[PDB]
Amino acid sequence: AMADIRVTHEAQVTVISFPAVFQRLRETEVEQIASTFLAAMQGAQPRKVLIDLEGVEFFGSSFIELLVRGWKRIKEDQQGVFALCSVSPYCVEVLQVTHIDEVWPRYSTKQEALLAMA
Amino acid sequence: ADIRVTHEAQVTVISFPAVFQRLRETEVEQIASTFLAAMQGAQPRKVLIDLEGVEFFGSSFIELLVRGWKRIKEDQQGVFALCSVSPYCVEVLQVTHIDEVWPRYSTKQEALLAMAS
Amino acid sequence: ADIRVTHEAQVTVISFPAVFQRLRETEVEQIASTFLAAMQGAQPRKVLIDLEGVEFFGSSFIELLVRGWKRIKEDQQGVFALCSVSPYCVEVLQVTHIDEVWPRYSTKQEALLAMAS
Amino acid sequence: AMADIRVTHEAQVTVISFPAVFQRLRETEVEQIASTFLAAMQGAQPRKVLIDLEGVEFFGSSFIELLVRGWKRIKEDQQGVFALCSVSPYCVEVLQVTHIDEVWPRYSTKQEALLAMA
Amino acid sequence: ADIRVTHEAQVTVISFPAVFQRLRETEVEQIASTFLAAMQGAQPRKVLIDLEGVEFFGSSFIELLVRGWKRIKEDQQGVFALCSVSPYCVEVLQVTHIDEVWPRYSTKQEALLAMAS
Amino acid sequence: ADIRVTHEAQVTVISFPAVFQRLRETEVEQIASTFLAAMQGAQPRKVLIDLEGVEFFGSSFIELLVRGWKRIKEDQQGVFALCSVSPYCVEVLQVTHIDEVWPRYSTKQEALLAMAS
Ligand SMILES: [Cl-]
Ligand SMILES: [Cl-]
């Protein structure tokens, strides 16, 4: 019954996407997805991960905290990459509160992100 | 549309009309002048940001609050407090450490009693 | 008043005079150009921010640090590190998640030695 | 109007105590007291701090987290001490979940704590 | 008094009578034998700890849960889940990292639907 | 199978063979006496726990580490440090707050050099 992120493998990148039921990511939603998300952070070096935020309209500290956990798992790979795409303008305003995303390249669409991460 | 500034119980109270449910860069610029003017009274300055009705904001609004707070914080006995912060707003404020030194109250009635001096 | 830039054990060390107990936007603006000028050394560039005596900073200092870090990280063999960061300042770095981006050491001698590995 | 911890100076130790209204320390109570608590962590080296938990019947992660913030502020003093006393049996069961209190000496009463910390 | 073990929808459900509002060392020893016996069924084992009515526990109970979980976790497709966890219990469980891999559900009805296989 | 104890640059280094990918209560019991025997060196005692290759541990390993730390910390000049700790394991240490008790380094060479300061 319980909704979850969807994890796809596209062009050597593990892509994390969100179903429509996850418009707003609070503490409850973050607990629901944490396990699938963190298990998707493994893979042969260099690991490349893209968080595709299309459809997501809100998040805050709980979700940023999860993303940081994912990033810490892959960040020691020399050519590892932890990227975002399709971030709504509001979610960008929330990201602007934190400084950590300065190390996560952000792209306007998945297609652009995938091409840049080849 | 602008914020509503009132003087209640020695406290300058900043409130938001319903139109400001979402506070993006545009809204922050609409209200910055009246907001910052409310930071300029007799010292020690006590300020209450009553966020009832406000459901979303980001860096723009936080930066305005911080700016107002830096005016008030000259005053050793000054207070810059928040009340009626919605759970969405809490989730955003938690992204930064800067707001921890602003006392939190559940409601305006509670804040004004707590802040009486 | 400005940052002190010294060269120790092949590391460019940035230190803060006593007057910078608090690094606010004002102080960050005073030191910005010397700081960024310090990021242009011979390769691989090793940089240590010795925060001894600094008791407060916030968002604008972090933004400056992130810039400098971005100039250094181009080096592959380069290191950008912090030491002697106060308990309050460590919290700021942890709450915004920027703490695990860079190595952080308790003391300068620990750092200078660690950074020779 | 708002209840707060009480901070006393006793025999060169900063003693933090709790009013009866704080039987149960959740997230809300921890926010109420954080500011007074953290401001009480300053003082000439060596700083000695005692958290007197008499009357407190419950706490969990939020309060332990605050205590850790206090402890980090004083822990670099070579003869610094961050101690607890008068911890109810239940609160000891909760402390047993965490490992950090293995570095905080615990004493059965304030009088005993103060004598040991001279 | 003992825990109540039932088999609902392929799931072994552990429930607590009202007398177990507080779970201290004594209570954990009262229930350990019936609890651990419920960890021994056909594989993959699915277990639900329905904590409705339970208001306080500490290390003793957490250690019992962990012990039961280590029996179940042999099973690659095994599940050890919690539901109806009170806010006091959440505050205690947050003190340790070990419980994060136990899924959480708000109610038993929700858990049993989620866990159906 | 047991821990490997080596002496490097005046530091007693504890390492784990490949088979200890997971340090549970069982593995913790196998290594406990060698580990504690390793804590009795010449003063000041410097000890490094090289956790390279360990992907999981929990409460009983932390308890062992805390014991060893308590034997070393008697030295005043002594150091007890960790390195090469996996991301999961760092979380365990942070959630129980034991991470800032000890220095933790990214690599062994970083640690051995840092610990000469
Ligand atoms: Cl796929
Ligand atoms: Cl006093």
What is the rounded distance in angstroms from the CA atom of residue F108 to the CA atom of residue F39?
18
> In C9-112, which ranges are E strands?
11-15, 22-23, 46-50, 56-57, 79-83, 104-105
**What residues of chain F, 43 to 62, have a C-beta less than 8 Å from chain D?**
59, 62
Contact E55, E87 (CB under 8 A): no
Please tell me the distance between residue D15's alpha carbon and the centre of ligand 2 in angstroms: 8
Q: In chain E, whose CA is at the least distance from the CA of A39?
A: E101
Give the residue among A98, C91, C54 at the shortest CA–CA distance from D38.
C91
Query: In which residue are the tokens 């935020």 written?
Result: A53
Query: In which residue are the tokens 């429509």 written?
Result: A20
Contacts of F109 in chain C (CB under 8 A): 117
For E59, the closest of D60, D64, D97 (CB atoms) is D97
Question: What are the residues facing F17 on neighbouring strands?
Answer: none
Contact A58, A25 (CB under 8 A): yes
Give the residue among A93, A109, A90, A110 at the shortest CA–CA distance from A101.
A93
Domains of chain C: 1-117 (3.30.750.24)
Query: What is the DSSP secondary-structure string of F20-56?
Result: GGEE-HHHHHHHHHHHHHHTT-SSSPEEEEE-TT--E
Phi, psi for F18 (deg, rounded to 5): -50, -40
Resolution in A: 2.1
Contacts of F66 in chain D (CB under 8 A): 99, 102
Residues 6+ apart with CB under 8 A from D95: D64, D87, D101
What is the rounded distance in angstroms from the CA atom of residue D113 to the CA atom of residue D83?
8
Residues 6+ apart with CB under 8 A from F99: F90, F93
Q: How was this structure determined?
A: X-ray
Angle value at C-alpha B112, between B111 and B117, nearest 5 degrees: 115
Alpha helices in D4-99 (DSSP H): 27-39, 61-74, 89-95
Give the residue among B27, B30, B46 at the shortest CA–CA distance from B38.
B46
Contacts of B24 in chain A (CB under 8 A): 89-90, 93
List the structure tokens of E61: 């109970």
Contact A25, A62 (CB under 8 A): yes
